[PDB]
Amino acid sequence: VNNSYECDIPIGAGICASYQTSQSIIAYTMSLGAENSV
Amino acid sequence: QVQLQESGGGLVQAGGSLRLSCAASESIFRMELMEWYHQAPGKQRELVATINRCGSTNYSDSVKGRFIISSDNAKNSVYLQMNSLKDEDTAVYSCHARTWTSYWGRGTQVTVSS
Numbered sequence A: 001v002n003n004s005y006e007c008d009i010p011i012g013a014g015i016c017a018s019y020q021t022s023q024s025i026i027a028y029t030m031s032l033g034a035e036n037s038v
Numbered sequence B: 001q002v003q004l005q006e007s008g009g010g011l012v013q014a015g016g017s018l019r020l021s022c023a024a025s026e027s028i029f030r031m032e033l034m035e036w037y038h039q040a041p042g043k044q045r046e047l048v049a050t051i052n053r054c055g056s057t058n059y060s061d062s063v064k065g066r067f068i069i070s071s072d073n074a075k076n077s078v079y080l081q082m083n084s085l086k087d088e089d090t091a092v093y094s095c096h097a098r099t100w101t102s103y104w105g106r107g108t109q110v111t112v113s114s
């Protein structure tokens, strides 16, 4: 998956996986959090 | 190895019958659950029919009474007999399978003429 989310399960090297509504389990690059600008 | 290979689609007149032969090299028993999907060009894919290892069968509203599922335990394949084909069955029917991991086949177009 291209989209990024919070890490649910850690696998390593900035990759994370979770179960969601193809493969039942998906993998994605972890997102550090919501972006902001001041 | 090709897995879930499909065969039996093509051109057919309205109201006819047809047979498609999605077959896979794997043990038909262990796979435990097989489905069917068609995707009319421009129409989001949609589930057709389902059947589990136990034997329970479900169909969509536009499916029952016209074509039912079947699977002989002699040659590893799932049989679904098209009957009384109409124009809005024109789509790309694909058989889908899932053991502990997902499996997918190439599908096959279906065209009905009127």
Ligand SMILES: *[C@@H]1O[C@H](CO)[C@@H](O)[C@H](O)[C@H]1NC(C)=O
Binding pocket: A001, A002
């Ligand atoms: C989306 O993912 C595909 C394959 O995973 C990749 O080829 C493509 O570059 C990605 N696009 C974006 C915008 O992330």
Ligand SMILES: *[C@@H]1O[C@H](CO)[C@@H](O)[C@H](O)[C@H]1NC(C)=O
Binding pocket: B028, B073, B074, B075, B076
């Ligand atoms: C597995 O079962 C199929 C029928 O479902 C049969 O044709 C085949 O010979 C069987 N294989 C073994 C190793 O028992």
